[PDB]
Amino acid sequence: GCNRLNKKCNSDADCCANKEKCERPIGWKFMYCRPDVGP
C-alpha cells in the first residue's frame, strides 16, 4: 500500500495522500512524513 511515515519530505506531495502530512518535528532540523488524523 502506502506508508511513508518518517521518510523525509519537502511537501505533502511527498507523503501518502490524506492520511499523512509533511512536518518538521519541534526541535528537529528536517521535515518528515507523519500521521494526519484530520481536523
Partner: protein
C-alpha cells in the same frame, strides 16, 4: 566522563486500519567515539546487516543521503573473521551517505577501545556507541523493522 555523551531520541509510528496511530518514543545515551566527530545529527535509521555491509562495490545504488546507521556487533567468538574492522564499517557507512553511525557494542565491548583509538584522523560524522540498557532500548525499536527516525545531540 560526562564529556562526549551522545543523547539519542528515536521515534517510530505504527498505524492501524482505523487510522488511529501509535507513536513509540525512546531516549537513550551513548558516547561519541574518538573515531568520529562530536556533532549533532539526525535522520532515518537504517540497520546495517552483515552481508550488505560487506558489499565492496562502488556504485551509486549503494548511496542514500542522510540516514543514521545502526550496527549490532556480534560476539567476537561467533564472528572471528569479519569483512571489515569496526572502524572500516563506520567508514563504509559514511561513504554510503550515513550522517552518523551507532554501534551496539554490548556483545563486543573490545570494539570500544578500537573506536576510541585517536591515532587515526576522525571521520567527519559522529560514530557513537551504545551498550547496556541504552543498547536494549535502541534495538527494541530497531527490531520492529519499521521506519524510525533518530536525533543525536551533544550536550
Amino acid at each position: 566522563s560526562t564529556k562526549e555523551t551522545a543523547f539519542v531520541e528515536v521515534v517510530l509510528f505504527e498505524s492501524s486500519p482505523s487510522g488511529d496511530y501509535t507513536t513509540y518514543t525512546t531516549g537513550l545515551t551513548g558516547r561519541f567515539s574518538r573515531a568520529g566527530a562530536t556533532l549533532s545529527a539526525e535522520g532515518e535509521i537504517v540497520q546495517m546487516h552483515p552481508l550488505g555491509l560487506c558489499n565492496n562495490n562502488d556504485e551509486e545504488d549503494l548511496y542514500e543521503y542522510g540516514w543514521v546507521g545502526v550496527v549490532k556487533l556480534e560476539q567476537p567468538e561467533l564472528d572471528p573473521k569479519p569483512c571489515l574492522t569496526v572502524l572500516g564499517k563506520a567508514k563504509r557507512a559514511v561513504q554510503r551517505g550515513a550522517t552518523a553511525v551507532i554501534f551496539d557494542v554490548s556483545e563486543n565491548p573490545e570494539a570500544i577501545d578500537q573506536l576510541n583509538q585517536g591515532s587515526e584522523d576522525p571521520l567527519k560524522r559522529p560514530v557513537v556507541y551504545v551498550k547496556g540498557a541504552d543498547a536494549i532500548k535502541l534495538m527494541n525499536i530497531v527490531n520492529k523493522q519499521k521506519v524510525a527516525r533518530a536525533r543525536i545531540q551533544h550536550r
